[PDB]
Amino acid sequence: LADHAARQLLDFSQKLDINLLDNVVNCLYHGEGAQQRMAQEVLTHLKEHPDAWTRVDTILEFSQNMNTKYYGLQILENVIKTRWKILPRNQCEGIKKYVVGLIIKTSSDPTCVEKEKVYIGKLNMILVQILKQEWPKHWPTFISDIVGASRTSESLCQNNMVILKLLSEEVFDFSSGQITQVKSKHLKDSMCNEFSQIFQLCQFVMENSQNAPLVHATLETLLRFLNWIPLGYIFETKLISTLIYKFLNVPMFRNVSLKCLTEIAGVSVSQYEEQFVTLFTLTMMQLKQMLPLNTNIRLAYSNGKDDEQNFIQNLSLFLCTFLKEHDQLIEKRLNLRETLMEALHYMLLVSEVEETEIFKICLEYWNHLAAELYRESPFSTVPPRRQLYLPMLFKVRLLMVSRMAKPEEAAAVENDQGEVVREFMKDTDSINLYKNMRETLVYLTHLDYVDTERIMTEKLHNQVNGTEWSWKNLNTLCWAIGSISGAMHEEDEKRFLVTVIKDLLGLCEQKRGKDNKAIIASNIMYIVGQYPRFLRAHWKFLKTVVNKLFEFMHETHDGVQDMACDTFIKIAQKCRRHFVQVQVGEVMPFIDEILNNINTIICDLQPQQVHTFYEAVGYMIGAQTDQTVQEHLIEKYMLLPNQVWDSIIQQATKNVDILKDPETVKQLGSILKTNVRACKAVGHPFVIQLGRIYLDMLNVYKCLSENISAAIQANGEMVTKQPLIRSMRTVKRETLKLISGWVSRSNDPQMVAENFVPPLLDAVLIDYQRNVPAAREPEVLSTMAIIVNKLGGHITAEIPQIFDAVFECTLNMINKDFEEYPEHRTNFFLLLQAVNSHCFPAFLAIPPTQFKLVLDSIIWAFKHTMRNVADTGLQILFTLLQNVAQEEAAAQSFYQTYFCDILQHIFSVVTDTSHTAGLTMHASILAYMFNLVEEGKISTSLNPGNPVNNQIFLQEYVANLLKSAFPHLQDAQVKLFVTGLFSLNQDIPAFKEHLRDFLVQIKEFAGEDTS
Amino acid sequence: EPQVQFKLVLVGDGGTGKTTFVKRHLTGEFEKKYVATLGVEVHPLVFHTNRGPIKFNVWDTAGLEKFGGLRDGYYIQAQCAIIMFDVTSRVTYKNVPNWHRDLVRVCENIPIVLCGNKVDIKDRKVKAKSIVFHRKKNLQYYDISAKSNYNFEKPFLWLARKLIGDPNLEFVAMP
Ligand SMILES: *[C@H](CC(=O)O)[C@H](C)[C@@H](O)/C=C/C(=C\[C@H](C)C/C=C/C(C)=C/[C@@H](C)C(=O)[C@@H](C)[C@H](O)[C@@H](C)C/C(C)=C/C(=O)O)CC
Ligand SMILES: Nc1nc2c(ncn2[C@@H]2O[C@H](COP(=O)(O)OP(=O)(O)OP(=O)(O)O)[C@@H](O)[C@H]2O)c(=O)[nH]1
Ligand SMILES: [Mg+2]
């Protein structure tokens, strides 16, 4: 259990202590903790050593526990994967025979089904590796040998079925990225070429054998074969009939069988029409035996065991697959109406299963059917296919209305600081589920508005009587009601909403107590927000709704206020017009009333809700087009926050120490959040407010920054977790947010550059440089990035001084490993990308040593394992190569200085197993660069060798570079790869596959020819 | 009641967040930086359910090919598994079948959850409509976000149900 004992395991001067190897492996699996790491290091270290497999046999001969035998098998797999083409031929034959003999011996023992199945599987995988390495050429009779030996014994045949399945998986499913392209084509052609023999064996076992495990393994293999085999074996043999009759109905075989059928149903081919019909017919005739249509499949799944559940899901998959691909074939056969309906009935039953995955499988088909019927004809209460499906479309509509998922998703998420904000998750599986249910229901509502309205009226009647009254059920009904918004004509929509609102009002009046009234009040709020056309059509209705929301903003009950604010912002965005223009029966536009009453409306809201409110009002203000009226609206709009802001600025002028008061900093952060939301809504004209506070804001930023910095130097890193430092960092972040957010939406780069940028240089940038490393706010860099991206040229001239502040001192934070200060790395290369992409003359205008530093930083970027960092680094390098190619004068000097350097760095990354994610970029660059050398490059990279053209110098230089990088390569290999670099420099995916082939080659030794 | 522990094996492509996930479950900390796991680290997690506490010895493995170690081997004697990818890198999803293959070749029949991490990032690349691999492999899928706690415990909850056999188990987070 000691490091020395572990080190003994790898001496190579003495016999292996299989006793000790077992102890170390048992430490690997059951070793508790601190030596576990040791034991793993030692086992990996031995496994990767060059001697490797010399002991493999010893391990297998003498060891007592399974894990150690498995470890030896790992070593054997390593040798076969990498150094097989360099073993002497007799060694390969000995390993071949050792392996198939071990496979034989293991299966014969009864215990194999028992005990270590894992070990048998690993052995079969070893043999499949040997096959992948040399199956056609060096083992030409293999398929014949094992097909014949399978008719001798049945256990041998079952294990050989597993072997054939693994070979199919390795040749046809996972060949790309593990096997070179030509060898993949070769293995596929070789398996496809000798397949009829294998299929004979399978037909024989299926039709004749009564060994249940062997039959199961054969079916499992037939699955993977269905993935790739020619259609003749599937649709021109006994196969479909044999599956449906002999295996689909018997319990232990029903899953696999059905899976196979599903795969066969996935094939989309015009020539096997009848067969497909058969496949449906027969399959249905079996399902009605095993699963009578009267069955509560919801209960059957809810109570049932694992294979029952798997069969229900496989049934959903089969019916969805077949119907989507071949519903037309059964539609045009009258003698099959009843059967088709039955299948649909099945789906409906399966749709009641409370399992969101199975339900998504069903909703896939329901959306398909609704979309097909809508594309046939989009009009209401006759086309033929819809006439076929009419007896059950109402069942489908009831399903959608009755199981509607929640429309949007909110969650309380805590930021980098302590603040828990209410974040609406934007793009999730559940929201996509809602959108699919909505699409289906909207299709079917277009097919018949009356039927949808009737189902909803019945659900809501059941709400009113108390039969189906629950917070959950009312929520679901209202979600559906909102989901069909826009599906009906505006007149039908109005009549329908009038009834809905009236009945919901009556239901409210009926129930008593805050909890019931709260649930009903939101549902009403949600429904109203979901119908903006109705609101724009009726003015008083809308005014009264808005008046109530303002009322609800004082309800202390939880969620009433939140829903009030959410509905307010939805209505404000969707009806902004109606607040700025004077309405019929009104003396002044509503915005002026709201602005006169802000302080009355928001006194009881929590800060986040106030932010939401101000954003909602900002949309209205942005709707007003006359610049002067809009200015006055903005001034009254920001009255209340500006009051507290000016109070705090004045107190700070009198005494700065109030900027260390907790509640003062909390208020400053809240005010800045309010400004940020207002700016998002209002847009460019918000400048009038921004410029009003700008300088003041920058001032407080500076001060707070310094505070945090000093607070670090006094107490180190710990101090960054205290509430006060936390709220100060919040102020800094909201300041940067407001600045970059207004700049993002500013339509005057001239004014921005001359007015708003210069104060940043000393207030934030040199302040960033002056901060202690841990105090530097990464969000500085990113904000600058945004500014650059928006300013373009109007900011080129200022690139130097900015870089004086942020560049040098940021590099030294992120050039001593690849991991610390991640936010800074990301934002830094974002800023550098912005500069290179929009202000390239600045790179041309700096000293060459500094440009060398910039280029080095780019290279440093794409060496990252942080994918986004390396990705933006490659993008920078690519657009930089093009930008250099833009001007002929410095292009040749840049090439002479950096071309080979860039090439060797990129090659260091391309051959790295940790950067494959960037392949598409790598190719795109290399291709480009190599194309550049074919023509378009005039000067010579090497002053000493001018005879040689760049292609000749590049060819031999890169070949030398790879030969010295990977010494175990062949000269022919390297020459072929280097010439392929030039040959494929205008087919980027072919170039990519060339790189992937080479990346496979650099992982295994090769001897003499490819053979 | 009984301290009923199970071996979980956690796999997926590099920098997918497997380790960040386990960190937040173990100490509530959210690690901001990528520090590649070498070989595997086995951390125990303990949840408390309405029917007694449950213990997951999580074998957080290394997705980087460089540092795979005994990749194949760690899967031995495992009761359950999680396969993770990154909804912001299509590559990480295209490799889900490979992790699943190498996983079920060792432990042929165990409950496996498939997780799409980083669902908080607004520029999602692996579109939610496009995750369908788990269907025919009878795997359960979730949209966790290690930073937002979106469906934070749902994978462990689902696995605890599938291992204890009570389709109504619940985490209570008792002392
Ligand atoms: C609790 C009730 C209780 O406890 O008694 C609930 C939750 C209420 O507090 C919530 C009500 C909400 C909204 C109401 C619907 C807002 C009222 C609107 C209203 C009174 C509109 C007037 C102007 C109408 O004209 C009414 C009578 C008419 O029915 C409208 C709805 C339709 C129209 C305009 C008909 C037409 O043909 O033009 C919470 C948001
Ligand atoms: N936006 C976002 N980023 C995340 C989330 N989870 C993790 N990350 C980031 O992604 C990276 C995850 O790193 P790790 O958790 O160490 O990754 P890993 O899968 O353990 O890596 P290996 O062990 O090497 O395979 C870090 O940079 C995290 O900040 C998440 O839910 N959202
Ligand atoms: Mg890790």
Number of domains of chain B: 1
Strand count of chain A: 2
Annotation, overall tally of beta strands of chain B: 6
CATH architectural designation of chain B:
3-Layer(aba) Sandwich
Count the DSSP helices of chain A.
50
Question: What's the structural domain tally of chain A?
Answer: 1
Strand content range of chain B: 25-35%
Give the ordered list of helices and strands of chain B.
EHEEEHHEHEH
CATH class of chain B: Alpha Beta
Strand order of the largest sheet of chain B: 2-3-1-4-5-6
What does the overall shape of chain A look like?
globular
Helical fraction of chain A: over 70%
Rg measurement of chain B, Å: 15 Å
Distance between the amino and carboxyl termini of chain B: 14 Å
PDB class: nuclear protein
Keywords: CRM1, inhibitor, complex, Exportin 1, nuclear protein
Assembly: dimeric
Entry title: Human CRM1-RanGTP in complex with Leptomycin B
Structure description:
- Chain A: One of its GO terms (cellular component) is kinetochore.
- Chain A: InterPro entries: ARM-like, ARM-type_fold, CRM1_repeat, Exp1_repeat_2, Exportin-1/Importin-b-like, Importin-beta_N, XPO1/5, XPO1_C_dom.
- Chain A: This is Exportin-1.
- Chain A: One of its GO terms (molecular function) is RNA binding.
- The complex is a heterodimer of chains A (1011) and B (175).
- With 1011 residues, chain A is mostly helical.
- Chain A has one domain.
- In chain A, 74% of the residues lie in helices and 1% in strands.
- Chain A is built from 50 helices and two strands.
- In chain A, strands 1-2 form a two-stranded antiparallel ribbon.
- The two termini of chain A are 47 Å apart.
- In chain A, 37% of the residues are buried.
- Chain B has a single domain, classed as 3-Layer(aba) Sandwich (Rossmann fold), CATH 3.40.50.300.
- The longest helix of chain B is centred in the middle third of the chain and has 11 residues.
- The two termini of chain B are 14 Å apart.
- Chain B is an alpha/beta fold and 175 residues long.
- In chain B, 42% of the residues are buried.
- The chains are: A mainly alpha (1011), B alpha/beta (175).
- Chains A and B meet through α3, α5, α7, α18 and α22 of A and α3, α4 and β6 of B.
- The site of Leptomycin B, bound form (LMB) has 17 residues of chain A, from α25, α26 and α28.
